Design a protein around this ligand. Structure first.
Ligand SMILES: [Cl-]
Ligand SMILES: [Cl-]
Ligand SMILES: [Cl-]
Length: 163
């Protein structure tokens, strides 16, 4: 565990993270995909061996000794708001179990279902709150990766609000 478990946010490519493992915003089929998933595929392609897993779950595959936790958020184009919200919360709960199982002291996480799976909506607060619900009971340092300057400021504010 981290000596003083923290949350941080950085505005940069999660494929360049400084943590002991990474969460991929995966698709259910283990395909290279788009956005975060395509960056993770370019950096750790070996971790897509048998990475297919259902919505609301996480599946870890090692790239060398570096764990890639493939977390499948719901596509809100397909899910109802209610069922989508349930599956998004479940995906993060499965990430917390994997981060714990791995015994890592840090993890790089993206906001699940906030990009092409957002169904055209701003889901920063929804996704981040599910992330906190799952990760608060873990003792890994969590480093959230985003690309938008306004999202960086809002995520940082939400972290600071609790401190
Ligand atoms: Cl970058
Ligand atoms: Cl997404
Ligand atoms: Cl973003």
């Amino acid at each position: 565990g981290a000596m003083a478990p923290s949350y941080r946010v950085k505005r940069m490519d999660i494929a360049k993270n400084d943590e002991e493992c990474v969460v991929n915003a995966a698709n259910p089929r283990g395909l290279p995909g788009d956005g975060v998933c395509k960056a993770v595929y370019k950096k750790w392609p070996e971790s897509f061996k048998n990475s297919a897993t259902p919505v609301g779950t996480a599946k870890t595959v090692m790239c060398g000794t570096y764990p890639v936790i493939h977390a499948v958020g719901p596509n809100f184009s397909n899910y109802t708001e209610s069922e989508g919200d349930r599956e998004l919360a479940a995906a993060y709960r499965e990430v917390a179990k994997e981060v714990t199982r791995l015994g890592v002291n840090s993890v790089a996480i993206p906001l699940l279902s906030t990009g092409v799976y957002s169904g055209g909506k701003d889901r920063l607060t929804q996704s981040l709150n599910h992330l906190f619900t799952a990760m608060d009971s873990t003792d890994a340092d969590v480093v959230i990766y985003c690309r938008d300057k306004e999202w960086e400021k809002k995520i940082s504010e939400a972290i600071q609000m609790r401190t």
